[PDB]
Amino acid sequence: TLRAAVFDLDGVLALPAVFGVLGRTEEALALPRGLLNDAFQKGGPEGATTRLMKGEITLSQWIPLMEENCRKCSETAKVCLPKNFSIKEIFDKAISARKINRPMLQAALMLRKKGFTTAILTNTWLDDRAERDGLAQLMCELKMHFDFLIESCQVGMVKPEPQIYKFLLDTLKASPSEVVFLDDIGANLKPARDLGMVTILVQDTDTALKELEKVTGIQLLNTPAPLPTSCNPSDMSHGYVTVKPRVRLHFVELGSGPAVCLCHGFPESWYSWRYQIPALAQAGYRVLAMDMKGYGESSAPPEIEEYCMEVLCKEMVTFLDKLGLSQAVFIGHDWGGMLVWYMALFYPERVRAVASLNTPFIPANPNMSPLESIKANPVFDYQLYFQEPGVAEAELEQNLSRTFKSLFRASDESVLSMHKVCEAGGLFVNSPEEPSLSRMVTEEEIQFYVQQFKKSGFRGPLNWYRNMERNWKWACKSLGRKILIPALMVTAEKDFVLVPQMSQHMEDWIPHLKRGHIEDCGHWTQMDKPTEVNQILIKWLDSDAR
Amino acid sequence: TLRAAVFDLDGVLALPAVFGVLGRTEEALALPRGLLNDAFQKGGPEGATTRLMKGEITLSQWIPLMEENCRKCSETAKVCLPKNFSIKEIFDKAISARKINRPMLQAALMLRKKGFTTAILTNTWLDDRAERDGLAQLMCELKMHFDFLIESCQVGMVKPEPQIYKFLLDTLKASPSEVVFLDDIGANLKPARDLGMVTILVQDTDTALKELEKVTGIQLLNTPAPLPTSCNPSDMSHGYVTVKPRVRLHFVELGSGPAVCLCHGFPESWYSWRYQIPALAQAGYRVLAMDMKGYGESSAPPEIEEYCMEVLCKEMVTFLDKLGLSQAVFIGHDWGGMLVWYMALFYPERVRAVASLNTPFIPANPNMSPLESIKANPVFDYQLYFQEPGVAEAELEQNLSRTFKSLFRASDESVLSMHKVCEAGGLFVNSPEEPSLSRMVTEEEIQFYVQQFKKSGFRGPLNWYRNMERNWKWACKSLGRKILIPALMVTAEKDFVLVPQMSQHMEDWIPHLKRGHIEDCGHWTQMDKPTEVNQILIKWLDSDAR
């Protein structure tokens, strides 16, 4: 019974195969059939290619030896190689053209999700070309989805030598009969088969996956659309910056490129961006997913005024200063969305671009107290319940699992009224003691938030809602300004508090505003519709932020 | 008696002044004298420029209002503005041409070093131009050297209004007579003078600094060359990555751009790079200054084999994988220099470029045991003393302050023999109990290393020297390779262990190798000759790593 799946790289996890390009080059240059593939494998185990695949030499040392084999082969075939014949060029192009075979990777992901130990076993080289970063990136994206990456040039062994298979079995801690092995080269399959492993000769992906699903008994083909890659907290780079003597800010960091600062809402975490962090880093950005003040590993001072917009924005500026960042793109959701519009209004020079999920930008009304304005809309009643220090802390902190299980639900799963919260005397008075687990979250994701909130609880988070008068006075100073830097507003159809229609007058203050819209999406945007969120953000980033 | 110094930005900390460009533009376009400066200040306190300087409007809202004032002014002066007259262009160029007035900044640094509270007081705007990042960077570099940055557009007050001066005095917690105030605008000096502050009208920097030194009694002019900016550990962004279940790696992070991974030697810290971190971030790089395995906040497992080159390099690859970095430039010193050459030999695809300080790259001799090779050179005797577990730990851990004070000395300060260390039975047998403080370090820098080494001591650090046979066997696999990626070798004239002549055959294995050389430099390269190190690295980075 199978418990491990092994994949080749070239022609299996990555397409098109480099060997395929040698043939394509022969045809394009009208060279004798197999001349290049013959020069490539020249000398077999004693040849230049074996030495390269074993790690004896690097790719740049191999290029001249391949040139010589190509000359020798053409001499024997009584033919001439063209004037501008360059092996470097042929390989540079082939390596660059090679992309991840998404359905193969998707099938590997599914097997690992169902308990399989997965591995990549590849005959590869030590790449020292000026353009090696493209291959480095490919391997990076691919390798993180597997338990093991076994590279011929790193182990000093090569397929089809029997020892690399014995090494593989030892790495997997598995007996041959427990292993499925997938290769596009029949000769490299032969030793695994001889050892007793299940083998699949990969020609077209679809037939390979039909074979793979028949042998594992797990559906790999015609599967529903998979969720984006998420984050395992213990595998992340965690960062800490002191912004002032008693305030430290925590963030999770992933990727290289322009800095993208992610700002969560209430009562959330850096983890609310779990589905965006890998996707945004893969799109070519340096992601900084914050634990906002009062949350997670960030400090939680008890004073209400430590949570007004002016102080929070000043701290985020200091955060940039301490990291040596002149700018960041600011993406926010809910309370993070509010802060992000204020960063754009007060510090435009420090904000590369600004994006908000659900949170509209509505200028302050100087002719009306903010407390009057909140009373005008019944959906904002929960905010008045959040006013009195201690009351909402008591209900929210009583049972953490019940809190997050009641809150983090989709539009078709609500257990929460909201409206007449004050009258009913609580957010959870008509909610069950043991809510069912929402389709958006697993038990373990709820427990990550539970553990996070055990440190400081809900005082610091609730204080974000306790600065209406302070926020309003500060916001009134910005009344003559417009937001003229790149800006994106993303509305969610089924958010009943931050409704799409509330954002309708935004173009008056943000003339060049760009928009996104997510259908059948509730308040918890990132986890409700991750794929859609990722598509809207990546497209807006590549077009407007670099 | 003075204790605070206040500087204007435009025409004082930054040159040339923007007002100066308005005049230069009038002359270039043969416009009436003062036409632009008149349109700029039009309406005085009621005008567009005051509203901008107060924060009522952003720079982009101000551009059209300036265009109108320019049209109105030309109409009155019975003149016409040229066909391609654009305020945006004039200001974009002026802002971009404006650089830090280095001797003014240097004088501000000296006053702060002698106990003064320093501040920048400026009439500035909220910059939302597409090219705002240039100004953002200027302010970032400048602001970090001062206690306070007071910006007119942020306080809603402007020079010469008396309230901004009262705000300044309150920010400084100083009485007027304790303040020197420097401005290039006589009108903006007048209220500070009226309050009783010492004022200096800045025309040419030199006369301003003569006035400033006469009034403070501190030498600011004709001063010796200042050391580069250093790091205050508590003001840095600290990062932590788990590379394996019991191994966590700590790093300090600063800047944006290509990732530059700094690898210290024995028995050092991320702090050994204190003079390089600010300089490298300012040059446009994202710096990752490591605490290598066994040091500082990084894990220190006790097993010798956890410190062989193979394991250390694999961990650094995982470090890159966990941060989402396909590559980094690897710069190392001493043991870090050795690791960095091995990263280039085994993982060329993950190494953008490689640089070593002092540490040469010498291929392993397969016909000689490494223990024989170390015995051949008398300068390597201390390495044999480091072999027996516990002996060197005992002497090095006995008195931490004495350890670092004896070790971290310049070429003309040695208290350490080295050679016949085993025979003498210790590194410090002929060294004082209370060494004098070396010219390279302050008391406080020694105490930072003392506190760092209190956590794990010297076992983990010493274990780097305890894998000769393991390292040699692994290195022998690389014997057929060459280093063909961008590489820099920096030799130090007075390093008596890692002597410049030891690097003489490097071009045989690294044909495209670039070199740097530092005269009158001992083993502790970074702190011995920071300025020279920074110049060699920045120049090599901008030319070879991007």
Ligand SMILES: CCCc1nc(-c2cccnc2)c[nH]c1=O
């Ligand atoms: C139908 C309830 C789902 C929901 N929750 C919120 C919410 C909850 C708690 C805090 N902030 C916002 C907002 N809008 C919503 O539709």
Ligand SMILES: CCCc1nc(-c2cccnc2)c[nH]c1=O
């Ligand atoms: C004259 C002594 C200065 C010195 N120290 C070392 C050294 C000390 C401790 C550890 N590793 C290296 C090397 N070369 C040197 O000139």
